[PDB]
CSV table of C-alpha atoms and ligand atoms in Angstrom, one decimal:
chain,number,residue,atom,x,y,z
A,21,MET,CA,0.0,0.0,0.0
A,22,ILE,CA,1.9,3.0,-1.4
A,23,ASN,CA,1.0,6.7,-1.3
A,24,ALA,CA,2.3,9.9,-2.9
A,25,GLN,CA,4.3,11.1,0.1
A,26,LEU,CA,6.2,7.9,-0.1
A,27,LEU,CA,7.0,8.4,-3.8
A,28,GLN,CA,8.4,11.8,-2.9
A,29,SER,CA,10.5,10.1,-0.2
A,30,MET,CA,11.8,7.6,-2.8
A,31,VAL,CA,12.8,10.5,-5.1
A,32,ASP,CA,14.5,12.2,-2.2
A,33,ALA,CA,16.4,9.0,-1.2
A,34,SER,CA,17.9,8.9,-4.7
A,35,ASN,CA,21.6,9.0,-5.0
A,36,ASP,CA,21.6,9.9,-8.7
A,37,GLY,CA,20.5,13.4,-9.3
A,38,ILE,CA,16.9,13.7,-10.6
A,39,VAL,CA,15.4,16.7,-12.5
A,40,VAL,CA,12.3,17.6,-14.5
A,41,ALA,CA,12.4,20.0,-17.4
A,42,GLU,CA,9.8,21.4,-19.8
A,43,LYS,CA,10.5,22.3,-23.5
A,44,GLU,CA,10.4,26.0,-24.3
A,45,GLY,CA,11.4,26.1,-28.0
A,46,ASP,CA,15.2,25.6,-28.0
A,47,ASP,CA,15.5,25.9,-24.3
A,48,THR,CA,14.4,23.2,-21.8
A,49,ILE,CA,13.9,24.8,-18.5
A,50,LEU,CA,14.2,23.1,-15.1
A,51,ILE,CA,11.0,22.9,-13.0
A,52,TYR,CA,12.2,20.4,-10.5
A,53,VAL,CA,15.4,19.2,-8.9
A,54,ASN,CA,16.1,16.7,-6.0
A,55,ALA,CA,18.7,17.2,-3.3
A,56,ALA,CA,21.2,14.8,-4.8
A,57,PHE,CA,21.4,17.1,-7.9
A,58,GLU,CA,22.2,20.0,-5.6
A,59,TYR,CA,25.0,18.0,-3.9
A,60,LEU,CA,26.3,16.8,-7.2
A,61,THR,CA,26.4,20.3,-8.7
A,62,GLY,CA,26.6,22.7,-5.8
A,63,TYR,CA,23.7,24.8,-6.9
A,64,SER,CA,20.6,25.3,-4.9
A,65,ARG,CA,17.0,25.1,-6.3
A,66,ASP,CA,16.2,28.7,-6.8
A,67,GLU,CA,19.6,29.3,-8.2
A,68,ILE,CA,18.9,27.0,-11.2
A,69,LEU,CA,15.1,26.6,-11.3
A,70,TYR,CA,13.5,27.7,-14.6
A,71,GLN,CA,16.7,27.7,-16.6
A,72,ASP,CA,18.2,25.3,-19.2
A,73,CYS,CA,20.7,22.9,-17.8
A,74,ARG,CA,23.5,24.0,-20.3
A,75,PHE,CA,25.0,26.0,-17.4
A,76,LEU,CA,26.4,22.8,-16.1
A,77,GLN,CA,28.6,22.6,-19.3
A,78,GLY,CA,30.0,26.0,-18.3
A,79,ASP,CA,32.4,27.4,-20.9
A,80,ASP,CA,32.4,23.9,-22.6
A,81,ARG,CA,29.7,23.7,-25.2
A,82,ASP,CA,31.4,21.8,-28.0
A,83,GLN,CA,30.5,18.3,-26.9
A,84,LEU,CA,29.3,15.6,-29.2
A,85,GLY,CA,26.5,14.7,-26.8
A,86,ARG,CA,24.6,17.9,-27.2
A,87,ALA,CA,23.5,17.2,-30.8
A,88,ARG,CA,22.2,13.8,-30.0
A,89,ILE,CA,20.4,15.1,-26.9
A,90,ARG,CA,18.6,17.7,-29.1
A,91,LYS,CA,17.7,15.0,-31.7
A,92,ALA,CA,16.3,12.7,-29.1
A,93,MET,CA,14.3,15.6,-27.7
A,94,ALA,CA,12.7,16.3,-31.0
A,95,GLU,CA,11.8,12.7,-31.7
A,96,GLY,CA,10.2,12.4,-28.3
A,97,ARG,CA,12.7,9.7,-27.4
A,98,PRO,CA,14.8,8.6,-24.4
A,99,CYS,CA,18.5,8.9,-24.5
A,100,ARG,CA,21.7,8.4,-22.4
A,101,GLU,CA,24.9,10.4,-22.9
A,102,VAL,CA,28.1,11.1,-21.1
A,103,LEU,CA,29.1,14.7,-20.7
A,104,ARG,CA,31.6,16.8,-18.8
A,105,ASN,CA,29.9,19.1,-16.3
A,106,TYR,CA,31.3,21.7,-13.9
A,107,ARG,CA,30.1,22.5,-10.4
A,108,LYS,CA,29.3,25.9,-8.9
A,109,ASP,CA,32.8,26.3,-7.4
A,110,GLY,CA,34.2,25.1,-10.8
A,111,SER,CA,35.1,21.5,-10.1
A,112,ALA,CA,34.9,19.1,-13.0
A,113,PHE,CA,32.8,15.9,-13.0
A,114,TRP,CA,31.7,13.3,-15.6
A,115,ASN,CA,28.0,13.0,-15.9
A,116,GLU,CA,26.0,10.1,-17.3
A,117,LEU,CA,22.7,11.7,-18.2
A,118,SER,CA,19.4,10.0,-19.0
A,119,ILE,CA,16.6,11.9,-20.5
A,120,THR,CA,13.2,10.2,-20.5
A,121,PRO,CA,10.3,11.9,-22.2
A,122,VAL,CA,7.1,11.3,-20.5
A,123,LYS,CA,3.7,12.8,-21.4
A,124,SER,CA,1.8,14.3,-18.5
A,125,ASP,CA,-1.9,13.3,-18.7
A,126,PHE,CA,-3.0,16.5,-16.8
A,127,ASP,CA,-2.2,18.9,-19.7
A,128,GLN,CA,-1.1,16.8,-22.6
A,129,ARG,CA,2.4,18.3,-22.5
A,130,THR,CA,5.6,16.3,-22.6
A,131,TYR,CA,8.0,16.7,-19.8
A,132,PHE,CA,11.6,15.3,-19.6
A,133,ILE,CA,13.1,13.5,-16.7
A,134,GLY,CA,16.8,13.6,-16.3
A,135,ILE,CA,18.9,11.2,-14.2
A,136,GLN,CA,22.4,12.3,-13.5
A,137,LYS,CA,24.9,9.6,-12.5
A,138,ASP,CA,28.3,10.6,-11.4
A,139,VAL,CA,30.7,8.2,-13.3
A,140,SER,CA,34.0,10.1,-12.8
A,141,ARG,CA,35.7,7.1,-11.2
A,142,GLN,CA,34.6,4.7,-14.1
A,143,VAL,CA,36.0,7.2,-16.5
A,144,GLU,CA,39.3,7.6,-14.8
A,145,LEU,CA,39.6,3.9,-14.3
A,146,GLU,CA,39.0,2.7,-17.8
A,147,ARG,CA,41.2,5.6,-19.0
A,148,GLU,CA,43.9,4.2,-16.7
A,149,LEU,CA,43.3,0.7,-18.0
A,150,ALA,CA,43.7,2.1,-21.5
A,151,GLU,CA,47.1,3.6,-20.5
A,152,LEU,CA,48.2,0.4,-18.8
A,153,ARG,CA,46.9,-1.7,-21.7
B,21,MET,CA,3.6,22.0,-9.2
B,22,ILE,CA,4.8,18.5,-10.4
B,23,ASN,CA,2.3,15.7,-10.7
B,24,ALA,CA,2.1,12.4,-8.8
B,25,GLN,CA,2.5,10.8,-12.2
B,26,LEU,CA,5.7,12.7,-12.7
B,27,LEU,CA,6.9,11.4,-9.3
B,28,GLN,CA,6.1,7.8,-10.4
B,29,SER,CA,7.8,8.2,-13.7
B,30,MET,CA,10.9,9.6,-11.9
B,31,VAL,CA,11.0,6.4,-9.8
B,32,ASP,CA,10.5,4.3,-12.9
B,33,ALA,CA,13.3,6.2,-14.7
B,34,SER,CA,15.8,5.3,-12.0
B,35,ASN,CA,19.0,3.6,-12.9
B,36,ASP,CA,19.4,2.1,-9.5
B,37,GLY,CA,16.8,-0.4,-8.2
B,38,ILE,CA,14.6,1.1,-5.5
B,39,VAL,CA,12.5,-0.6,-2.9
B,40,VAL,CA,10.3,0.3,0.1
B,41,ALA,CA,10.0,-1.8,3.2
B,42,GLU,CA,7.7,-1.7,6.3
B,43,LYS,CA,8.7,-3.0,9.7
B,44,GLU,CA,6.8,-6.2,10.3
B,45,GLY,CA,7.2,-7.5,13.8
B,46,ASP,CA,10.9,-8.4,13.6
B,47,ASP,CA,11.4,-8.2,9.8
B,48,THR,CA,11.3,-5.7,7.1
B,49,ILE,CA,8.9,-6.8,4.4
B,50,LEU,CA,8.8,-5.3,0.8
B,51,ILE,CA,5.8,-3.2,0.0
B,52,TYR,CA,7.3,-1.7,-3.1
B,53,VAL,CA,9.9,-2.4,-5.8
B,54,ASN,CA,10.6,-0.5,-9.0
B,55,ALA,CA,11.4,-2.2,-12.3
B,56,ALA,CA,15.1,-1.5,-12.2
B,57,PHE,CA,15.2,-3.7,-9.1
B,58,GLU,CA,13.3,-6.5,-10.9
B,59,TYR,CA,15.6,-6.7,-13.8
B,60,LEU,CA,18.7,-6.2,-11.6
B,61,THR,CA,17.6,-9.2,-9.5
B,62,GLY,CA,15.8,-11.3,-12.1
B,63,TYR,CA,12.8,-11.7,-9.8
B,64,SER,CA,9.5,-10.2,-10.7
B,65,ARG,CA,7.1,-8.2,-8.5
B,66,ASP,CA,4.7,-11.0,-7.8
B,67,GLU,CA,7.5,-13.3,-6.7
B,68,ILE,CA,9.1,-11.0,-4.1
B,69,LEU,CA,6.5,-8.4,-2.9
B,70,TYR,CA,5.7,-8.7,0.9
B,71,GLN,CA,8.8,-10.6,2.0
B,72,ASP,CA,12.1,-9.7,3.7
B,73,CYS,CA,15.0,-8.8,1.5
B,74,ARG,CA,17.3,-11.5,3.0
B,75,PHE,CA,16.6,-13.7,0.0
B,76,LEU,CA,19.2,-11.7,-2.2
B,77,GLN,CA,22.3,-12.8,-0.2
B,78,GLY,CA,21.7,-16.4,-1.4
B,79,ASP,CA,24.2,-18.9,-0.3
B,80,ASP,CA,26.3,-16.5,1.9
B,81,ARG,CA,26.4,-15.5,5.6
B,82,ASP,CA,25.7,-12.4,7.7
B,83,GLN,CA,28.9,-10.3,7.3
B,84,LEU,CA,29.5,-6.8,8.7
B,85,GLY,CA,26.8,-5.8,6.3
B,86,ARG,CA,23.9,-7.9,7.6
B,87,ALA,CA,24.6,-7.2,11.3
B,88,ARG,CA,25.2,-3.5,10.9
B,89,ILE,CA,22.2,-3.3,8.5
B,90,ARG,CA,19.9,-4.9,11.2
B,91,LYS,CA,21.5,-2.7,13.8
B,92,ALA,CA,21.0,0.6,11.9
B,93,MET,CA,17.6,-0.6,11.1
B,94,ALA,CA,16.7,-1.2,14.7
B,95,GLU,CA,18.3,2.1,15.6
B,96,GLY,CA,16.4,3.9,12.8
B,97,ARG,CA,19.7,4.9,11.2
B,98,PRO,CA,21.0,5.1,7.6
B,99,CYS,CA,23.5,2.5,6.4
B,100,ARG,CA,25.4,1.8,3.2
B,101,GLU,CA,27.0,-1.6,2.4
B,102,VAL,CA,28.3,-3.5,-0.6
B,103,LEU,CA,27.2,-7.1,-0.9
B,104,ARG,CA,27.4,-10.1,-3.3
B,105,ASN,CA,23.9,-10.9,-4.5
B,106,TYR,CA,22.4,-13.4,-6.9
B,107,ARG,CA,20.0,-13.1,-9.8
B,108,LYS,CA,17.3,-15.8,-10.4
B,109,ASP,CA,19.5,-17.6,-13.0
B,110,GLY,CA,22.3,-17.6,-10.4
B,111,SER,CA,24.3,-14.7,-11.7
B,112,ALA,CA,26.5,-12.9,-9.2
B,113,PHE,CA,26.6,-9.1,-8.9
B,114,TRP,CA,28.0,-6.5,-6.5
B,115,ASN,CA,25.1,-4.5,-4.9
B,116,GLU,CA,25.8,-1.2,-3.3
B,117,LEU,CA,22.8,-0.9,-1.0
B,118,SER,CA,21.7,2.2,0.9
B,119,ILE,CA,19.0,1.9,3.5
B,120,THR,CA,17.3,5.0,4.9
B,121,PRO,CA,14.6,5.1,7.5
B,122,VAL,CA,11.8,7.5,6.7
B,123,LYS,CA,9.4,9.3,8.9
B,124,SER,CA,6.8,12.1,8.5
B,125,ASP,CA,4.8,9.3,9.7
B,126,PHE,CA,1.1,9.8,9.5
B,127,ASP,CA,1.1,6.0,9.5
B,128,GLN,CA,2.3,4.4,12.8
B,129,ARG,CA,4.6,1.8,11.1
B,130,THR,CA,8.0,2.8,9.9
B,131,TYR,CA,9.3,2.6,6.3
B,132,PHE,CA,12.8,2.1,4.9
B,133,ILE,CA,13.9,3.1,1.5
B,134,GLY,CA,16.6,0.9,-0.1
B,135,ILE,CA,18.7,1.8,-3.1
B,136,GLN,CA,20.4,-1.1,-4.8
B,137,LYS,CA,23.1,0.1,-7.3
B,138,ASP,CA,25.1,-2.4,-9.5
B,139,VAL,CA,28.8,-1.7,-9.0
B,140,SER,CA,30.2,-4.9,-10.4
B,141,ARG,CA,31.9,-3.4,-13.4
B,142,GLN,CA,33.6,-0.5,-11.5
B,143,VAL,CA,34.8,-3.2,-9.1
B,144,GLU,CA,36.3,-5.4,-11.8
B,145,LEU,CA,38.0,-2.5,-13.6
B,146,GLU,CA,39.5,-1.3,-10.4
B,147,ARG,CA,40.6,-4.9,-9.6
B,148,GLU,CA,42.2,-5.0,-13.0
B,149,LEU,CA,43.8,-1.6,-12.8
B,150,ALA,CA,45.2,-1.9,-9.2
B,151,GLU,CA,46.4,-5.4,-10.1
B,152,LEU,CA,48.0,-4.2,-13.4
B,153,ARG,CA,49.8,-1.5,-11.4
B,154,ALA,CA,50.9,-4.0,-8.8
C,1,FMN,C1,15.6,17.0,-18.3
C,1,FMN,C2,17.0,17.4,-18.9
C,1,FMN,C3,18.1,17.4,-18.1
C,1,FMN,C4,19.3,17.8,-18.6
C,1,FMN,N1,20.4,17.8,-17.7
C,1,FMN,C5,21.6,18.1,-18.2
C,1,FMN,C6,22.7,18.1,-17.3
C,1,FMN,O1,22.6,17.8,-16.1
C,1,FMN,N2,24.0,18.5,-17.8
C,1,FMN,C7,24.1,18.9,-19.1
C,1,FMN,O2,25.2,19.2,-19.5
C,1,FMN,N3,23.0,18.9,-19.9
C,1,FMN,C8,21.8,18.5,-19.5
C,1,FMN,N4,20.7,18.5,-20.3
C,1,FMN,C9,20.9,18.9,-21.8
C,1,FMN,C10,20.9,20.5,-21.9
C,1,FMN,O3,20.1,21.0,-20.9
C,1,FMN,C11,20.4,20.9,-23.3
C,1,FMN,O4,19.0,20.8,-23.4
C,1,FMN,C12,21.1,20.0,-24.3
C,1,FMN,O5,22.5,20.3,-24.4
C,1,FMN,C13,20.5,20.3,-25.7
C,1,FMN,O6,21.6,20.8,-26.5
C,1,FMN,P1,21.8,22.4,-26.6
C,1,FMN,O7,22.4,22.9,-25.3
C,1,FMN,O8,22.7,22.7,-27.7
C,1,FMN,O9,20.4,23.1,-26.7
C,1,FMN,C14,19.4,18.2,-19.9
C,1,FMN,C15,18.3,18.2,-20.7
C,1,FMN,C16,17.1,17.8,-20.2
C,1,FMN,C17,15.9,17.8,-21.1
C,2,FMN,C1,14.2,-1.1,2.3
C,2,FMN,C2,15.2,-2.2,2.5
C,2,FMN,C3,15.9,-2.7,1.4
C,2,FMN,C4,16.7,-3.8,1.5
C,2,FMN,N1,17.4,-4.2,0.4
C,2,FMN,C5,18.3,-5.3,0.5
C,2,FMN,C6,19.0,-5.7,-0.6
C,2,FMN,O1,18.8,-5.2,-1.7
C,2,FMN,N2,19.9,-6.8,-0.5
C,2,FMN,C7,20.1,-7.4,0.7
C,2,FMN,O2,20.9,-8.3,0.8
C,2,FMN,N3,19.4,-6.9,1.9
C,2,FMN,C8,18.5,-5.9,1.8
C,2,FMN,N4,17.8,-5.4,2.9
C,2,FMN,C9,18.0,-6.0,4.2
C,2,FMN,C10,17.4,-7.4,4.4
C,2,FMN,O3,16.0,-7.3,4.5
C,2,FMN,C11,18.0,-8.0,5.6
C,2,FMN,O4,18.0,-7.0,6.6
C,2,FMN,C12,19.4,-8.3,5.2
C,2,FMN,O5,19.4,-9.5,4.4
C,2,FMN,C13,20.3,-8.6,6.5
C,2,FMN,O6,19.8,-9.9,6.9
C,2,FMN,P1,19.6,-10.1,8.5
C,2,FMN,O7,19.5,-8.8,9.2
C,2,FMN,O8,18.3,-10.9,8.6
C,2,FMN,O9,20.8,-10.9,9.0
C,2,FMN,C14,16.9,-4.4,2.8
C,2,FMN,C15,16.3,-3.9,3.9
C,2,FMN,C16,15.4,-2.8,3.7
C,2,FMN,C17,14.6,-2.3,4.9
C-alpha cells in the first residue's frame, strides 16, 4: 500500500540526481530538482530553477553529446549520454545523463526526466586501464 | 507543481533499483519495488513483494553488512554496504545498498527506502587496474 508522500520520499532518497524539465522552444527549463542534484552540482534550487541545464557545461559547449540530446528531444525519445559538467565552485565531473520523455496526462504536454549519475571514477579507471593496456 | 505521475515516472526512470519496506514484527517486508530492481535481481514483482530482502544474499552468511544493517535498522539509522547478491539464473553481482529510515509518519509503522546500485563493473575494472599496477 503506497501513497504519494512515499513516492516523494523515494525520489529524495535517490543518489543519482533527478530533474524535471519542460521544453520552451530551443531551451528546456528546469521545473524540479532533487537534493542529490544539488549536492552533485553545488547549486541550490532557486539558483537553477527555470533555466536550461546548459550552465552545467560551463564554458564547454562543443561536446558531441549535445547534438544527440537535441535530436532525441525532437523525436520524443529517451537517450543516455556522457558529458563533462562543472560544479558551482568550478570542479569538473563526468555526468551520465538519461533523459526520459514522459507525457503528462494532466495537460497533454511532454516533460523530460533527467537522471544524473556521477561516473568520474569509471571514466578515470577505464582511462587508466587504457594507459596500462 | 509537479504531478504524482511525474513522481512515479521519476521512480520508474531510475538507474538504481529502488525498494520500500515496512517494519513487520521483527522483519522488514517489501511493500514496493521499482522495475530497475526487478531486472537487476531477475525476480518479478509478484515473486518478491511482501517478504524480507534477506533472499538476495543467497548462499552466503551475515557479514559486517547484515549485522550493521539490522542494527542501523533497529536504531532507525541510515546505512550503506556493498554485498554479493544473486539473480534468479544464479548470476553474481555486487550490490551497493543504501538503507534509509523514513518518517513524516502519519502512519504508525516505519518505512525504509533501499537503493540497490550495481557496481560490479567498477569493481572489476578497479581490480584489473590496481592489479595491473601491482
Ligand atoms: C531534463 C533534462 C536534463 C538535462 N540535464 C543536463 C545536465 O545535467 N547536464 C548537461 O550538461 N546537460 C543537461 N541537459 C541537456 C541540456 O540542458 C540541453 O537541453 C542539451 O544540451 C541540448 O543541447 P543544446 O544545449 O545545444 O540546446 C538536460 C536536458 C534535459 C531535457
Ligand atoms: C528497504 C530495504 C531494502 C533492503 N534491500 C536489501 C537488498 O537489496 N539486499 C540485501 O541483501 N538486503 C537488503 N535489505 C536487508 C534485508 O531485508 C535483511 O536485513 C538483510 O538481508 C540482512 O539480513 P539479517 O539482518 O536478517 O541478518 C533491505 C532492507 C530494507 C529495509
